[PDB]
Ligand binder design. Structure first.
Ligand code: G1I
Lengths: 286, 53, 333, 232
């Protein structure tokens, strides 16, 4: 079905263009205007850079692999592409985790947040969160620790065509945990605390001036966590599942869920960079 | 009182002679035209002459 | 009592009639045939960062390089515009400030604020040289007549000439109904004018200590004052979105600078060298450059995060820098 | 020659000093005490303890307060403060300002002017109702009717949701709640949730007002942060 292949290529190109355009728009809005330079906005810049490098590097190569059904480049470039993919995904998710933690500290400790977070501290934590992401991605892939003992996998690793992912229990479990599961629980806990604080504040307001003339909080939390959980949870669930059981799931569903995780990066600039200052800057640029 | 301090001030402020507005406008125009050659904001400045760039 | 009130009204009517008779033809008619200056484009050559809060006032040095800026952080910073680096940093006993000035000798820096005292700092020596007191309100603006005597625009509706060595008011000028919010010195030290929060703007003579002329064209309060470079005219800023120019010899307003797009006040006004471009810092986020003679918005300066509160052109007219409520200065050219 | 090196060293020293100053400045919070002279602002300031400054710290948080002393254009200086403390004499309904209008009405006019000021749009105001005991004495005993001085009192009733203080008379509770509701109706009419009002009934005997100020500042900062991220 050449029509199906053409449509898949068209939609892949559309996703590439959308991700690149949104990410470069966000990053140039941060760079050009000194008003947007804020301690919390450095995390947004880091997330934008991670999503941008992911969209520029692995989305086009992945789309080419999907369309051509083979890896045209070298064997080492396949490992480099896989490492870039893992690094980008881990860095992006950990950056969402860092943003959630920063917001939590902003609300739960109103007085100490002013001095606890500084520009130097923001730079240090951004460097650390980028370094930890690289260690889980580049170190195992380059040092061949993620290599499995499966017969067909090891057979095709020498082959130039085989660039499909293959991993054993250890690397799969560790990478999945570190990349997604710890950020997930951290973000859900901090957002539950923030929701509790918002509900307490709303109750105080109602008791204060309710006689005179939580939908917004729930809607915002759904727009924040929903676009991330719905896009990444299935992929990591099936990751652990198929690593646990070889014949549990097929490869097409795994690739589709991985691509859902990829396209998640498009929603992040809209999910987070939606401040009225951001809108004004975008209108000025347009 | 306060009324005297203001009435006397108005009396002493309206006695000054007034030049015609045409002469004042001509003087301002002449000054601007004469000194426009030395204005660095009004006219673009060369890169060598510009100290900020 | 009431009999003297009628005499004042008659005198005011006579003054208004004389001013109306003097106005044979408006400045707009005479300048009609002159060529427009065209569009004036300016760019921020250097942005001076380091301030912790909003800047209210700035004053260029005697030369074209040194600056001084006062902010609510409690620190005065003297910059070097030619290399965009700080030279001195002076703390304050009072956190809130409203004005600053730079001596023509280049050795003294005067700072005021909500604290009624006026502080003078010895740049060439940063200890407080003298703390002038006696005003019963905030100091809107201070200027250096010389290295030995200054003048201040207090909030008690009384501008007073000070003496640094003596530390006491040599002369006090009174008569303004409202608080004085701006002040500027003529090229000669003999005369100066001050704009008050009432509509009227008064001209004061230092030698005699008595006001000579009063201009009441505006309807709102005055916020900015600046003489024409020759010293025979001056323009004012108002919160009613109107900038107006007055002639001392003609004793009447000449032109008004207004536009339907602007409904915000003016916080700072200064004249470019040769008096052709009127630079006014508006209460909105941008700055508008007005033609002095044609009342045409030749250029617009934009790029400030918050309201522009200060504006000044160098003595040699080399460049202009604006001090906004954002913590960053910006030098234009 | 060496002028560039000297200027670079001076910049380094000044930048380090200014970084320390920025840290200590962001560490502290400012407060403005804006109240009538007859409202006993001085005694409340002393209770917490040209322009008078007061420094007090609670829970290792440094609060810094300024007391000033006409159309006021010095307000524009205070466009960036954590909160504005308003002290109003709740017992000043009967008294008339010298040369006459009700002092409480003058306080209401001042509150309306401050609340609707363009520069103070984003700043929350903390309301203190000073001299509560005098108000209680006036309402409980004396030939003074709130309705005659304030016409809206006749129609006003004590709200059901209102919680009176322990061992409090009904008439004084109604009077104090009407006084509070006047300010609250002035406040809630305008504003888009950026800034709120926090009325408080206090007296010279009460010594817990500093804790109230601390809690209200915490609530103000929390509300600002929550509305910034669009969860409030
Ligand atoms: C080739 N696709 C990879 C395979 C496994 C993996 C991904 C992303 C983050 C991780 O922590 C992973 O372990 C996927 O993007």
């Amino acid at each position: 079905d050449e029509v199906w292949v053409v449509g898949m290529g068209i939609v892949m190109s559309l996703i590439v263009l959308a991700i690149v355009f949104g990410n470069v728009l966000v990053i140039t809005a941060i760079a050009k205007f000194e008003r947007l330079q804020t301690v919390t906005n450095y995390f947004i810049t880091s997330l934008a850079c991670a999503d941008l490098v992911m969209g520029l590097a692995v989305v086009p190569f992945g789309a080419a692999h999907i369309l051509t059904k083979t890896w045209t480049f070298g064997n080492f470039w396949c490992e480099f592409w896989t490492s870039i993919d893992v690094l980008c995904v881990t860095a992006s998710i950990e950056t969402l985790c860092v943003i959630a933690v920063d917001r939590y500290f902003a609300i739960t400790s109103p007085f100490k947040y002013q001095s606890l977070l500084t520009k130097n501290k923001a730079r240090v934590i951004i460097l650390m969160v980028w370094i930890v992401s690289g260690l889980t991605s580049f170190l195992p892939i380059q040092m061949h620790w993620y290599r499995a003992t499966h017969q067909e996998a090891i057979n095709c690793y020498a082959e130039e065509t085989c660039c499909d992912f293959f991993t054993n229990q250890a690397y799969a479990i560790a990478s999945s945990i570190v990349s997604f599961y710890v950020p997930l629980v951290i973000m859900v806990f901090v957002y539950s605390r923030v929701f509790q604080e918002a509900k307490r504040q709303l109750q105080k307001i109602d008791k204060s001036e309710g006689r005179f003339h939580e939908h917004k909080a729930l809607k915002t939390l759904g727009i924040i966590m929903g676009t991330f959980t719905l896009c990444w949870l299935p992929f990591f669930i099936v990751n652990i599942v198929h690593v646990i059981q070889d014949n549990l799931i097929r490869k097409e569903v795994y690739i589709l869920l991985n691509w859902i995780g990829y396209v998640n990066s498009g929603f992040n600039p809209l999910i987070y960079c939606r401040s009225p200052d951001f809108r004004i800057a975008f209108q000025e640029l347009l | 009182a306060q009324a005297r301090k203001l009435v006397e001030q108005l009396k002493m402020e309206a006695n000054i002679d007034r030049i015609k507005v045409s002469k004042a406008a001509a003087d301002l125009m002449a000054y601007c035209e004469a000194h426009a050659k030395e204005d660095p904001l009004l006219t673009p400045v060369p890169a060598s002459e510009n100290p900020f760039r | 009592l009431d009999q003297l009130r009628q005499e004042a009204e008659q005198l005011k009517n006579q003054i208004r009639d004389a001013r109306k008779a003097c106005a044979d033809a408006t400045l707009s008619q005479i300048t009609n045939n002159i060529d427009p200056v065209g569009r004036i484009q300016m760019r921020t050559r250097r942005t001076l960062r380091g301030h912790l809060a909003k800047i209210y006032a700035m004053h260029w040095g005697t030369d074209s390089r040194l600056l001084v800026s006062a902010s609510q952080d409690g620190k005065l910073i003297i910059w070097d515009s030619y290399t965009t680096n700080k030279v001195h940093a002076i703390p304050l006993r009072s956190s809130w400030v409203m004005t600053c000035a730079y001596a023509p000798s280049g050795n003294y820096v005067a700072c005021g604020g909500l604290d009624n005292i006026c502080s003078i700092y010895n740049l060439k020596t940063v200890r407080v040289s003298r703390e002038l007191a006696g005003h019963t309100g905030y100091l809107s603006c201070c200027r250096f007549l010389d290295d030995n005597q200054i003048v201040t625009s207090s909030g008690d509706t009384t501008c007073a000439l000070w003496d640094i060595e003596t530390g006491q008011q040599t002369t006090t000028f009174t008569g303004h109904t409202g608080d004085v919010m701006s002040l500027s010195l003529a090229p000669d030290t003999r005369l100066f004018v001050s704009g008050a929060c009432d509509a009227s703007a008064k001209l004061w003579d230092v030698r005699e200590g008595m006001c000579r002329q009063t201009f009441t064209g505006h309807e709102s309060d005055i916020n900015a004052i600046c003489f024409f470079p020759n010293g025979n005219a001056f323009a004012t800023g108002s919160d009613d979105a109107t900038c107006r120019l007055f002639d001392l010899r003609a004793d009447q307003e000449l032109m008004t600078y207004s536009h339907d797009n602007i409904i915000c006040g003016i916080t700072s006004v200064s004249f470019s060298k040769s008096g052709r471009l009127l630079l006014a810092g508006y209460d909105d986020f941008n700055c508008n450059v007005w033609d002095a003679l044609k009342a045409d918005r030749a250029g617009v300066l934009a790029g400030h995060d918050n309201r522009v509160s200060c504006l000044g052109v160098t003595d040699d007219g080399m460049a202009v820098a604006t001090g906004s409520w954002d913590s960053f200065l910006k030098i234009w050219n | 020659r060496n002028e560039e090196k000297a200027q670079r060293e001076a910049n380094k020293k000044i930048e380090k000093q200014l970084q320390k100053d920025k840290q200590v400045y962001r560490a502290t919070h400012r407060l403005l005490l804006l109240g009538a002279g007859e409202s006993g602002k001085s005694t409340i300031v002393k209770q917490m303890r040209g322009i008078f400054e007061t420094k007090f710290q609670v829970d290792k948080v440094n609060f810094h307060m300024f007391d000033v002393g006409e159309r006021r254009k010095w307000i524009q200086c205070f466009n960036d403060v954590t909160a504005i403390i308003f002290v109003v004499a709740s017992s000043s309904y009967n008294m008339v300002i010298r040369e006459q209008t009700n002092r409480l009405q003058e306080a209401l006019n001042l509150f309306k002017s401050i609340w609707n000021n363009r520069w103070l749009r984003t700043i929350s105001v903390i309301l203190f109702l000073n001299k509560q005991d005098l108000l209680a004495e006036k309402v409980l005993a004396g030939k003074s009717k709130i309705e005659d001085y304030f016409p809206e009192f006749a129609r006003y009733t004590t709200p059901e949701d209102a919680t009176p203080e322990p061992g409090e008379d009904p008439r004084v509770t109604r009077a104090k709640y009407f006084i509070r509701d006047e300010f609250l109706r002035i406040s809630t009419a305008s504003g888009d949730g950026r800034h709120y009002c926090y009325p408080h009934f206090t007296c010279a005997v009460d010594t817990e007002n500093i804790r109230r100020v601390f809690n209200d500042c915490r609530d103000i900062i929390q509300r600002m942060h929550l509305r910034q991220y669009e969860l409030l």
